[PDB]
Design a protein around this ligand. Structure first.
Ligand SMILES: CC1(C)CCC(N)(C(N)=O)CC1
Lengths: 237, 300
């Protein structure tokens, strides 16, 4: 059924699974018209499909042309997400196909179930975790490839860089979720923490800086401070 | 006008005939039901006084044979049987009528209720849902499960309603996933009406039979089927005008007949609120909507 704090180690076992997050599929700017009406302009979006064990990220870029002439876009976006996830699964070799897909929002359940009818043995699950994957577009290299796209495109990343050489996938996911939660709560301060020291760079083939084990501990503490700082600034504590 | 005689009434029982019912006391001199209107299916049903568990009964059509009821003390129920000897049967009935040991089917002349509830119900279709080919009549009870229920366990005792499943390959054309899920017209009109039922009369007959088994026996799988068949129509943007007109009449009389005190268990809030207020056909069911709002406003 649903994925929560009680069954958390299941994410890191050897059954292939994917998280699917549709937050950033349909993105708009809201603006006034010349007559004082309100109108939206779409910008490019993305499906965030992540294997939490391996870090493999299947970033399907959603180009604004896919919305042209369509109605009820927020509803369409869920079905388009499910179509593209289904197409990804069919594109993978059988031994690489997931045994479970976990959607971060419950409104993706029926669209994805319907698109995956041909895969009755792939479990479609919700989660009670509030995962910060919407902040994926605060990762500069991901935002850059989405905004530059001129047509639909899939780009593959490892969202853990080389961390699994040194830490477990449980610890890697914890680091990722902490980084993303910080970027979601205060993007400016989080990015300041991550780059303040010019001697630590981001490798061309990486998303995050090349921190030593000790520097990651400092960074992680600074992110937890940020999240608690904002939690106080918010609630006045 | 036809007759279903009873050999005897050895156990206290509430006996239903269609929407009517009467209590018979243990060993009371009851010998059957006369003046049964020809032209409709009928159902004669039972609830024992000492174990209200298991309502059960028999669907029949007196045009198809001479039928009677006889209690079986081994299996512990009132059984329907066919009498093949016509002169024997006529002589039994005439004796029981002369001794006035029969109740009369108590139909008010103005009253079209039973017609309205069974308009599209045919015995030949009942006998395909309820498979027991050696009898001309069909047994149904409170506990019998449907084919669909069994899939999710004795198959000879199942209700073989047509399986409807909105998240199934049958319902969803590859490549029309969103379209077919949000507008079920292809599933209704091509798969079900053209494909399986052949016409709307047979679809309505199964819908009406499902409702009647839900109401008379408390059969839960029948209630599921009745609601699935309503929801499939209401969730279709493209429905022939005659079916919308006919569905409003069918449901109106079903809601009218339902015991007020069984609404909590026989009516699915989600289905009815969706059908009346959210679906494509939300403004195509005026009579059903008016009686529902005046009789069961809580549910809504
Ligand atoms: C007027 C009529 C005889 C037919 C149409 C109706 N079913 C409706 N518009 O819901 C009401 C009853």
């Amino acid at each position: 059924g649903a994925m929560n704090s009680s069954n958390y180690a299941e994410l890191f076992n050897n059954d292939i699974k994917l998280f699917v997050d549709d937050t950033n599929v349909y993105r708009v700017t809201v603006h006034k018209t010349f007559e004082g009406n309100v109108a939206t302009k779409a910008i490019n979006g993305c499906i965030f499909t992540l294997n939490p064990k391996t870090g493999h990220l299947f970033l399907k870029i959603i180009h604004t042309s896919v919305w042209a002439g369509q109605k009820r876009l927020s509803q369409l976006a869920k079905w388009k997400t499910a179509e593209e996830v289904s197409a990804l699964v069919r594109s993978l070799p059988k031994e690489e196909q997931p045994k479970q897909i976990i959607v971060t929002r419950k409104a993706m359940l029926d669209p994805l179930e319907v698109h995956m009818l041909d895969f009755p043995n792939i479990a479609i699950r919700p989660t009670e975790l509030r995962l910060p994957f919407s902040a994926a577009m605060s990762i500069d290299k991901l935002s850059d490839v989405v905004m530059k796209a001129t047509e639909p495109q899939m780009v593959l990343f490892n969202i853990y860089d080389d961390w699994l050489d040194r830490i477990s996938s449980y610890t890697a996911f914890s680091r990722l979720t902490l980084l993303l939660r910080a970027l979601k709560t205060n993007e400016e301060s989080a990015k300041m923490i991550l780059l303040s020291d010019p001697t630590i760079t981001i490798k061309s083939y990486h998303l995050w800086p090349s921190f030593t084990d000790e520097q990651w501990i400092t960074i992680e503490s600074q992110m937890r401070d940020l999240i608690l700082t904002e939690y106080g600034r918010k609630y006045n504590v | 006008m036809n007759t279903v005689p009873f050999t005897s009434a050895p156990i206290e029982v509430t006996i239903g005939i269609d929407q009517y019912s009467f209590n018979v006391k243990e060993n009371q001199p009851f010998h059957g039901i006369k003046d049964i209107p020809i032209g409709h299916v009928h159902v004669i049903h039972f609830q024992h006084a000492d174990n209200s568990s298991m309502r059960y009964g028999y669907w029949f059509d007196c045009r198809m044979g001479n039928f009677y009821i006889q209690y079986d003390p081994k299996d512990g129920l009132y059984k329907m049987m066919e009498e093949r000897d016509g002169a024997k049967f006529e002589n039994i009935v005439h004796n029981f009528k002369e001794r006035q040991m029969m109740v009369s089917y108590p139909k008010i002349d103005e009253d079209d209720t039973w017609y309205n509830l069974t308009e599209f119900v045919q015995m030949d279709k009942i006998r395909k849902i309820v498979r027991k080919d050696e009898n001309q009549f069909s047994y149904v009870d409170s506990s019998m499960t449907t084919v669909q229920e069994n899939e999710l366990s004795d198959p000879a005792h199942s209700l073989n309603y047509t399986v409807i499943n909105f998240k199934s390959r049958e319902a969803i054309r590859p490549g029309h996933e969103m379209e077919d899920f949000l507008d079920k017209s292809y599933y209704l009109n091509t798969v079900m009406l053209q494909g399986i039922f052949k016409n709307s009369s047979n679809y309505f007959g199964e819908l009406q039979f499902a409702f009647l088994n839900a109401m008379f026996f408390g059969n839960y799988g029948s209630s599921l089927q009745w609601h699935a068949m309503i929801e499939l129509i209401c969730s279709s943007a493209t429905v022939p005008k005659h079916m919308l007109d006919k569905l409003d009449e069918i449901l109106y009389y079903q809601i009218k007949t339902l015991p007020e005190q069984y609404s909590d268990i026989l009516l699915n809030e989600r289905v009815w609120n969706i059908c009346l207020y959210s679906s494509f056909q939300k403004n195509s069911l005026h009579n059903t909507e008016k009686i529902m709002e005046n009789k069961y406003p809580e549910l809504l």
